[PDB]
């Protein structure tokens, strides 16, 4: 609803016998990636991944590269501690993932902050919506919770999320506005493919849209066909835009009873589509 987000996504993966853990970061504004960092690169540095961030000066790239390097070291300590918390051997590979950032409304004010973690793909600990307290998933994460309560760690996260996060996201929006503040509506169509004498597939397509959030549904006689609709995951085209389709198997002769409904932020009004022979 005119809103925007910034998110950073960190992955640290240990690899016993194959070096120290790898740390990768990516940063997004909404559905647009704009930076990366990879500790396995030949000379690890924050790098631009969108044209609108290229303008930032050498101080930007230098500062941020030192932040990632320090974070990577911190994640290495975290991974060691986590192996102990779960009584795990030194032989296995493990993964520590972090996601954090801020959502703002059309006026630029903070709507929500996030700062959370997963270990081996399972939720571990999360900063609560209040930005003051933590939810721990198990007794290991209660250890991290007690440490971070003692350290008043949430106060620091809060200060970032209400301050720098919002301020930098506002800047990025202004610098990248022609892309970041533009919704590209889906180009839509319906195809028809006989399966047999008795049945046909209707597939409703949405192409070329941004951002990625969309709803595609089929109705039969105005009734949603949730249980009978094949939906693919929304997927990137490679040109900043996204694609999706939804299909239904229908009795031959009944195609006109089916309507495809499309909702997207770039559409003034939801679309209704039918197969047009």
């Amino acid at each position: 609803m005119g809103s925007h987000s910034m998110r950073y996504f960190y992955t640290s993966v240990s690899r016993p016998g194959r070096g120290e853990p790898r740390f990768i970061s990516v940063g997004y504004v909404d559905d647009t990636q704009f930076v990366r960092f990879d500790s396995d690169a030949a000379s690890p540095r924050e790098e631009p991944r969108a044209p609108w961030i290229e303008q930032e000066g050498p101080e930007y790239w230098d500062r941020n590269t030192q932040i990632y390097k320090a974070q990577a070291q911190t994640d290495r300590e975290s991974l060691r501690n986590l192996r102990g918390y779960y009584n795990q051997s030194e032989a296995g590979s493990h993964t520590l993932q972090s996601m954090y950032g801020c959502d703002v409304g059309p006026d630029g004010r903070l709507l929500r902050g996030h700062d959370q973690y997963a270990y081996d793909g399972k939720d571990y600990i999360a900063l609560n919506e209040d930005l003051r307290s933590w939810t721990a998933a198990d007794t290991a994460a209660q250890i991290t919770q007690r440490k971070w309560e003692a350290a008043r760690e949430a106060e620091q996260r809060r200060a970032y999320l209400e301050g720098e996060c919002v301020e930098w996201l506002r800047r990025y929006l202004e610098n990248g506005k022609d892309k970041l503040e533009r919704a590209d509506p889906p180009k839509t169509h319906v195809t028809h493919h006989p399966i047999s004498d008795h049945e046909a597939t209707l597939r409703c397509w949405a192409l070329g849209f941004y951002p990625a959030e969309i709803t595609l549904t089929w109705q039969r006689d105005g009734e949603d066909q949730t249980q009978d609709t094949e939906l693919v995951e929304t997927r990137p085209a490679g040109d900043r835009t996204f694609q999706k389709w939804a299909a239904v198997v229908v009795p031959s002769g009944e195609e006109q009873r089916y309507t495809c409904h499309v909702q997207h932020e770039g559409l003034p009004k939801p679309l209704t589509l039918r197969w047009e022979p």
């Binding site: 974070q71 986590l82 350290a151 996060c165």
Partner: peptide, 9 residues
């Protein structure tokens, strides 16, 4: 810009 000064788990 990413966040700085986070402590270990």
């Amino acid at each position: 810009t990413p966040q700085d000064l986070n402590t270990m788990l």
